[PDB]
Amino acid sequence: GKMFFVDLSRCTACRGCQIACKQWKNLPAEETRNTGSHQNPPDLSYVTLKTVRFTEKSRKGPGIDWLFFPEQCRHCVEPPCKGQADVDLEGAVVKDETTGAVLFTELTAKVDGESVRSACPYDIPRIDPVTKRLSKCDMCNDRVQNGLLPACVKTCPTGTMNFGDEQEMLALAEKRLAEVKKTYPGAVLGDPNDVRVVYLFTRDPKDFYEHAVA
């Protein structure tokens, strides 16, 4: 199916992607406050399928290493979330075989949402406290089927966000890694054989986020 290649070496933390996700799905805004960071919402939630995580790492001399991580569902090739939900109710979590999207339906309201969230090695699923439905990034599966890029991919001004067929995207990831590795010797791909959202990190992925990789 399809794959995202996310070149974090080009991210300006503009948060176009974060906003474009909400504009396309007409998602509500959260109540947020500043608690000493640009990062907000602080976490994914039932109404936030993507947030840009900001981490400052000290470096000797002027400036810092400012790490940006636009988090989303990895659309796992063999998704653990689905293994858990299926025990309660097939149809809560389904795989779109055209795109590779892992999709939550309204039937997630009838499964053990806590267990589904715990099964995810990237800690992605989020529960609505009211309806008990689960939400996360759906890959903009309906745009993709209709020949459009995901909202967060089309909006990205920097070339961070890339989307296409898995062969094309894995070839781009390999080529781009070699190139970026020049400037960022610790650069690596995130779990490139297990997921459909392949991040290029500029250093230890766990510096970007504790669940950046499995």
Partner 1 sequence: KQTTSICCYCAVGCGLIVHTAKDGQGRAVNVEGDPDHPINEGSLCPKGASIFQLGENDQRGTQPLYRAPFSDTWKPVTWDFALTEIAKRIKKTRDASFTEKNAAGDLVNRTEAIASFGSAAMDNEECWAYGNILRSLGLVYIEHQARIXHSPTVPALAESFGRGAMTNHWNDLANSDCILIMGSNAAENHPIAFKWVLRAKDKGATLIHVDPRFTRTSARCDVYAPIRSGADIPFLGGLIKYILDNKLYFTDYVREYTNASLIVGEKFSFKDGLFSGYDAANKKYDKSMWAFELDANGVPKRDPALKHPRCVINLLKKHYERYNLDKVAAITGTSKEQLQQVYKAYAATGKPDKAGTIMYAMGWTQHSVGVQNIRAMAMIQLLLGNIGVAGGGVNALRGESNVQGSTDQGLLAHIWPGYNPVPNSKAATLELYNAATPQSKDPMSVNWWQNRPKYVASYLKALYPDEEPAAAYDYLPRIDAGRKLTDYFWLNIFEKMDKGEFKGLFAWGMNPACGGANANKNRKAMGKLEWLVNVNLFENETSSFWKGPGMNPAEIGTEVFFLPCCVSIEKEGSVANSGRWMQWRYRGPKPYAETKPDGDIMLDMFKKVRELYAKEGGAYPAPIAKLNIADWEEHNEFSPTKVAKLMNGYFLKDTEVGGKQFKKGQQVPSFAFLTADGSTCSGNWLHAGSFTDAGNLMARRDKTQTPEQARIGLFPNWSFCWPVNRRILYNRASVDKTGKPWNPAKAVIEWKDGKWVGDVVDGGGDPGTKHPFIMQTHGFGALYGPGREEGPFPEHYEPLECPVSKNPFSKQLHNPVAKAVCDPRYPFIGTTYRVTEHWQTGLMTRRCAWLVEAEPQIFCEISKELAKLRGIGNGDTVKVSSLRGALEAVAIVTERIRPFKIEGVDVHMVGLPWHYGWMVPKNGGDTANLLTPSAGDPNTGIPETKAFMVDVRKV
3-state SS track over the chain: CEEEEEEHHHCCCCCHHHHHHHHHHCCCCCCCCCCCCCCCCCCCECCECCEEEEEEEECCCCCEEEEEEEECCCCCCCCHHHHHHHHHCCCCEEECCCCCCEEECHHHHHCCHHHHHHHCCCCCCEECCCCCCEECCCCCHHHHHCCCCCHHHHHCCCCCEEEEEHHHHHHHHHHHHHHHHHHCCCCEECCCCCCCEEEEECCCHHHCCCCCCC
* Binding to ligand SF4 in span 101-140, by CB under 6 A: 102, 120, 122, 124-125, 136-140
11 near partner 1, judged by CB under 8 A: yes
Nearer to ligand SF4, 62 or 193 (CB): 193
22 near partner 1, judged by CB under 8 A: yes
Does residue 129 have a known ligand-binding role? Answer: no
Give the integer Cα–Cα distance in Å for 204 and 197.
17
98 near partner 1, judged by CB under 8 A: no
Question: Using CB distances below 5 to 8 A depending on partner kind, what does residue 1 bind out of partner 1, ligand SF4, none?
Answer: none
212 near ligand SF4, judged by CB under 6 A: no
**Binder of ligand SF4 out of 81, 187, 198, 213 (CB under 6 A):** 81
Question: Using CB distances below 5 to 8 A depending on partner kind, what does residue 37 bind out of ligand SF4, partner 1, none?
Answer: partner 1
Rounded to 5 degrees, φ, ψ at 178 are -50, -45
Question: Using CB distances below 5 to 8 A depending on partner kind, what does residue 36 bind out of partner 1, ligand SF4, none?
Answer: partner 1
50 near ligand SF4, judged by CB under 6 A: yes
Question: Using CB distances below 5 to 8 A depending on partner kind, what does residue 80 bind out of partner 1, ligand SF4, none?
Answer: ligand SF4
At its nearest, how many Å lie between ligand SF4 and the CB of residue 59? 21
42 near partner 1, judged by CB under 8 A: no
Nearer to partner 1, 16 or 113 (CB): 16
